Amino acid sequence: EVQLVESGGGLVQPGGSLRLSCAASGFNIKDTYIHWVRQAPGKGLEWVARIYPTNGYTRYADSVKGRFTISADTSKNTAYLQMNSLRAEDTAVYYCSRWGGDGFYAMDYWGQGTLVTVSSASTKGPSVFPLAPSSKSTSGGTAALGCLVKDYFPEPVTVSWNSGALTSGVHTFPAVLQSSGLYSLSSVVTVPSSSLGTQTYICNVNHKPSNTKVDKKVEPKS
Amino acid sequence: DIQMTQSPSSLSASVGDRVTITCRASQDVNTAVAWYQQKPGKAPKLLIYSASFLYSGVPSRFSGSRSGTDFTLTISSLQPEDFATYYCQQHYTTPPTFGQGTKVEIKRTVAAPSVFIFPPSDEQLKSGTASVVCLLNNFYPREAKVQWKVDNALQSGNSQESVTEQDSKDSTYSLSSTLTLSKAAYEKHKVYACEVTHQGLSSPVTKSFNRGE
Numbered sequence A: 001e002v003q004l005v006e007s008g009g010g011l012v013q014p015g016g017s018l019r020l021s022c023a024a025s026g027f028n029i030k031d032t033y034i035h036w037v038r039q040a041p042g043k044g045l046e047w048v049a050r051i052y053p054t055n056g057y058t059r060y061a062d063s064v065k066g067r068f069t070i071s072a073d074t075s076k077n078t079a080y081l082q083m084n085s086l087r088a089e090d091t092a093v094y095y096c097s098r099w100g101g102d103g104f105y106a107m108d109y110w111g112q113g114t115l116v117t118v119s120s121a122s123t124k125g126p127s128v129f130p131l132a133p134s135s136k137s138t139s140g141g142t143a144a145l146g147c148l149v150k151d152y153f154p155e156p157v158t159v160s161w162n163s164g165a166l167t168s169g170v171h172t173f174p175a176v177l178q179s180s181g182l183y184s185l186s187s188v189v190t191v192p193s194s195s196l197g198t199q200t201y202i203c204n205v206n207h208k209p210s211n212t213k214v215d216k217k218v219e220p221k222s
Numbered sequence B: 001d002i003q004m005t006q007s008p009s010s011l012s013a014s015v016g017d018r019v020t021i022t023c024r025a026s027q028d029v030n031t032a033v034a035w036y037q038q039k040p041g042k043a044p045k046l047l048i049y050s051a052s053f054l055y056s057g058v059p060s061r062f063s064g065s066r067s068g069t070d071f072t073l074t075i076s077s078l079q080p081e082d083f084a085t086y087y088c089q090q091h092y093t094t095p096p097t098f099g100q101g102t103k104v105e106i107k108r109t110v111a112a113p114s115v116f117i118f119p120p121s122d123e124q125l126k127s128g129t130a131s132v133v134c135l136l137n138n139f140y141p142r143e144a145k146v147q148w149k150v151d152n153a154l155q156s157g158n159s160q161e162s163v164t165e166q167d168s169k170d171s172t173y174s175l176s177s178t179l180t181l182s183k184a185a186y187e188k189h190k191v192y193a194c195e196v197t198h199q200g201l202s203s204p205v206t207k208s209f210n211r212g213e
């Protein structure tokens, strides 16, 4: 089966350079056009560039013309996007896609995308604080508890409960950017009130960009 | 540059309803138009190619049609998994251009939220900041009003909301509202309350705690 796999994204300073790659499998990029398409956080899709790897001919969107270079190496079945003079406007998920070819000009296969964040802000791991279940939780009913994952940069963070054993009733909220310029989110779960004080609830927080891993026990306050 | 003007920006429909999304090309693009579905956190997925042809693996409820410069995506029977943003695209000329997208959500019966309030942890207070969290769990519709009261004084400019994506199982939403205060302000006041207004609630619901009790 055809697959496209992007790599090379990350956090980069404004004015810097970054090279993305797109490795193709299950087909040969000589037979197709390869594209980059990007999506800024919360925005629509925007085509960036295309290449025909057999002759190397390229086309660019006006917003990246002169700053970005698309290229390909048919002997590696891989395409590249060299990004230079990066601006905050360039922050986006970058997708690789292809045209089907042979008269087919829709984008039938896409990669999962690679996130590029252009910012002068340093990495920072989150602090994790308990959202302790209320002592007024209705006896024999349903109680809520959670974790507050505060003050981290950049995105993303992942949260699980009891190392994946607890999934039903979990809501991990989309992060919000605080006025400080750091992200924050909460993860909550509803559980039977009878389970409080006996069942253990641990949120597992992973912030790969800062290599931060925190397991936080959430229990009723004494 | 050919423009693709997509309407509506968003829509809500019940399971089994017929949904119509339209796009007007600024000039003739023949049938060089494709439709894509994008679910949260995922890459776009091709639904329709050459204006009217169903792509691989796409359920038969999806179809596309063309009349002149008017392009229409139809979902004949909306399903809960169809919650997504839909995009048209022309590829008649370079650059290929996308429509602005249509956000589709599922309309279901009204469900009132279950409301919970959380005080700041002692560990956070040691850092000098206090976060108070109000949770609205598993409700519909998404619209809700959450107001913070500190010693019966309405708060403004110090809270942020976040909303989950629509649930795949029961088509509901959950919402958090987070109040941020300094440690000194948090220790001066006593009564912390979040007041919730929603169509599923006959009267507003208030959850509150007294600091230290």
Ligand SMILES: *C(=O)CCCC[C@@H]1SC[C@@H]2NC(=O)N[C@@H]21
Binding pocket: B151, B188, B189, B190, B191
């Ligand atoms: C400072 O900003 C005013 C603090 C008001 C606190 C109020 S006064 C009445 C309530 N009882 C109490 O002990 N604190 C609350």
